Ligand binder design. Sequence first.
Ligand code: E6N
Ligand code: MG
Ligand code: ZN
Length: 329
Amino acid sequence: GVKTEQEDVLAKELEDVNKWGLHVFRIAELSGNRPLTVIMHTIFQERDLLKTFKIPVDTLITYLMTLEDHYHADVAYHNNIHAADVVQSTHVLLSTPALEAVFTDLEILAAIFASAIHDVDHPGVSNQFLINTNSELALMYNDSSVLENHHLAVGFKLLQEENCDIFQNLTKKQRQSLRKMVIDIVLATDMSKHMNLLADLKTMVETKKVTSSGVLLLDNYSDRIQVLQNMVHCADLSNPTKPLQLYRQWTDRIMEEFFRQGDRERERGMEISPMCDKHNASVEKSQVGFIDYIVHPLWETWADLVHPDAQDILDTLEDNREWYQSTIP
Ligand SMILES: COc1ccccc1COc1cc(C2=NN(C3CCN(c4ccc5ncc([N+](=O)[O-])n5n4)CC3)C(=O)[C@H]3CCCC[C@H]23)ccc1OC
Ligand SMILES: [Mg+2]
Ligand SMILES: [Zn+2]
């Protein structure tokens, strides 16, 4: 009735779940490659989501293990560890003081569940790649947000496996509302929505109303969903805002995946893709561009929205950017 020592050591790492910079690779090791399961489980307990939504525990574990098993282990970046990290990041973002008591449990659950499924069954290559190779996924989704339509459909479909329906006691109203939120959040992880999402987040900060004390007011679906959409998208682009030991690992793993797409574009290649070659284009300049044009404009705008809650995160982002710069000849 008491834990094993590996389980204990894992429980002790998991005490860092509410903090930015969790040792997620270590959790993956300690969990036997189950970081998405142990983290989602921990989060659901801490947020009381099992009681609130009458989720049987064995059903949750069954679904989570099934979900984690359709993330590919032979993909270096877009795997269960990335899912876990994004779940845990979204989890922290939701506890930010500026958002205290703003969102409902169904919203919280949508944000978390979305984060969990958002890259499921990712094949390790890009939308453009899938489209140019005339792949079945691109044909099925009529070329638009191919991967993101796929992740949603797999995540939802897995609820139908044996003892996997975690939402079996939600009413139809809740299930319809949850389903819609989750669709809207995951579709927003397509990077081609980045510029519009960011515009709409800048507009919100311009017009930012406030409640009785420092907490945002969001009185319509369109704004609430916008915030949750930019929240999960922030989490998905959170690697450069982590301690550098973490960030470097993520960079290695993205580079492997992208070099591997390169190597799969020699025969086909439909001609090389953006800065993915050992021959040319530094890894370091690529991180500096990523941070300058994408990651920092987003996190900066997020930081005004939740001011001063994100200062530390933005500081780390800026330190990491100066570090990558300083490593360029
Ligand atoms: C810019 O970083 C590059 C570039 C090439 C190779 C490696 C990295 C490493 O950075 C990381 C990127 C990513 C992601 N990347 N992308 C996009 C980003 C924009 N993009 C280009 C292409 C060419 C170019 N020239 C100048 C720019 N520029 O700076 O504006 N670009 N941006 C296409 C690829 C995804 O689709 C996302 C899926 C979901 C979320 C995030 C994913 C994740 C972690 C990363 O590092 C840990
Ligand atoms: Mg994705
Ligand atoms: Zn992702």
